[PDB]
Write a protein that binds this ligand. Structure first.
Ligand SMILES: *[C@H](O)[C@H](C[C@@H]1CCNC1=O)NC(=O)[C@H](CC(C)C)NC(=O)OCc1ccccc1
Ligand SMILES: *[C@H](O)[C@H](C[C@@H]1CCNC1=O)NC(=O)[C@H](CC(C)C)NC(=O)OCc1ccccc1
Lengths: 296, 296
């Protein structure tokens, strides 16, 4: 039986109206236009050679308002102020964006998911769903020219911006900032080898997703266990330890299925100790309990 | 190494501006508002009992322009004409949609992909990527209230609408129409058991996707073969036979990788005859050669 449960992004239209192209010299990336401010990654001011070890304060002294070409489709927005805000530039412009949605800036926590609007040369290209990893990377789909693309959640009428894209690490995963310009994790916007912590599997999301498999009809993977025994297993297999807070979070899903959280933990325990579910021959950890519900 | 290759939907903003809510009696679903026309599934005129065996011509005689409540956010659009167009209603309205994009209607072929904007009560909820299956179903994510949600591709400024959602089959997969109201496949909009052909795997897309794995660094699955020998294998494993047209289609990918199409076919042959690649412990067949390229 085809469940239809799958990764789904939020509708992107509210964010598409906010994307501009920002060029400084021969570097081009994307900017986010909200009211009369355009935010973009500060390494737009870098040349090729600068990115290996940039002195951002120094590179910026050589720039002026007129150094930044901001393009919203056909129009050119006039820059009337520029300043560095952590790893972003804040470019003040003469025109407030009439398509500015209701919005807020949010610093998401590891394990939380969001939608990415991937953009190139200021033009949206595609949308997909991502998670903030325990080691503060995200496993995105980003190519050259994608910096300044943003991640977001929508709640009713309101866009909560949580991510702006800056860089790719040697393992192919991605690092970036919140919209206050502050990197997630220990990363810095320099093109030198940087290592992410080893990456833990998001237990809370695996559990929620194993619930979805049960809500969709699957159950071949269902013994019980205790919190401390499961956490002993989790430490062995690079899963995050479970807390009572997470148990409470899973409450609703546990009711609908009439399956005990700790019974699900015992199923997960066997799977880890032994070795398909909703298709994947592995355990999906980028669905939150929220996502599993919204989608049912 | 994390490739980042993944299913990506088109940005949905152009389509979001076209979605309305259509209610007739106690049945509510989604409509598509383009210029001064609203399209929706004709089973909006059905009650519960009607859907088991509907006489649509007869149910419609009992309706009038004022039977259809069309809601675009706050506004109510006045219906000034209604007619049946195959399995859709065409509802003429007094107001041309100012957010109508450049668009066309396209009947897609099996193997082609498109984005779905899933909607409920006229409000977009999420976006994801789907394929038209060889047996003319799609493996969607649709719940009650989702009918009238549409599938689409975007090429530059232009939306090509290819799907409107009508129904779920007993296996959990989905059936619907193009925007001229014509079902894909042999299905009809009646809630009785209907069987889809057995579903073939889309060889052309599997090959393209095995190319992506090579473009992303993977190669553990790479002997050669001939077209007729591979097609002998394909028939055994419920894969579509390969043609020279498909070989030509794969030309570009074959160049970039410097790997012969038929060499890839030999890799696929072993995998089928023997038994991970870009993550999946199985072979993804809902990426077209187009998608693999656009994303590189
Ligand atoms: C901004 O568009 C760009 C996005 C990178 C390029 C390829 N994939 C991405 O996610 N960011 C950078 O190029 C970044 C700039 C520094 C000042 C931080 N450097 C970087 O990501 O280096 C690693 C890398 C570059 C090119 C291909 C693969 C990895
Ligand atoms: C329209 O929103 C609705 C969408 C179905 C409901 C659940 N998942 C879907 O994709 N379409 C129908 O309810 C359809 C109407 C007939 C006149 C064709 N009937 C239908 O799909 O029956 C099968 C079914 C119903 C409910 C749950 C699962 C399967």
């Amino acid at each position: 039986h085809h469940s239809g449960f799958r990764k789904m992004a939020f509708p992107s239209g509210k964010v598409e109206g906010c994307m501009v192209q920002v060029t400084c010299g021969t570097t081009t990336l994307n900017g986010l236009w909200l009211d009369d401010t355009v935010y973009c990654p500060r390494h737009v001011i870098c040349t090729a050679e600068d990115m290996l070890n940039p002195n951002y304060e120094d590179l910026l002294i050589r720039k002026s308002n007129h150094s930044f070409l901001v393009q919203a489709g056909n129009v050119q927005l006039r820059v009337i102020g520029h300043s560095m805000q952590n790893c972003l530039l804040r470019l003040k412009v003469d025109t407030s964006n009439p398509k500015t949605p209701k919005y807020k800036f949010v610093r998401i926590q590891p394990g939380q998911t969001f939608s990415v609007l991937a953009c190139y040369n200021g033009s949206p290209s595609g949308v997909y769903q991502c998670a903030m990893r325990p080691n503060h990377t995200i496993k995105g789909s980003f190519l050259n020219g994608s910096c300044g693309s943003v991640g977001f959640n929508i709640d009713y009428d309101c866009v909560s911006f949580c991510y702006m894209h800056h860089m790719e690490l040697p393992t192919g995963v991605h690092a970036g900032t919140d919209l206050e310009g502050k990197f997630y994790g220990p990363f810095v916007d320099r093109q030198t080898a940087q290592a992410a912590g080893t990456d833990t599997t998001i237990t809370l999301n695996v559990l929620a997703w194993l619930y979805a498999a049960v809500i969709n009809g699957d159950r071949w993977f269902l013994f019980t266990t205790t919190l401390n025994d499961f956490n002993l297993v989790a430490m062995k297999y690079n899963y995050e330890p479970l807390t009572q807070d997470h148990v409470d979070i899973l409450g609703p899903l546990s009711a609908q299925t009439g399956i005990a959280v700790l019974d699900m933990c015992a199923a997960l325990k066997e799977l880890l100790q032994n070795g398909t579910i909703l298709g994947s021959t592995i355990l999906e950890d980028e669905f939150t309990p929220f996502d599993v519900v919204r989608q049912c």
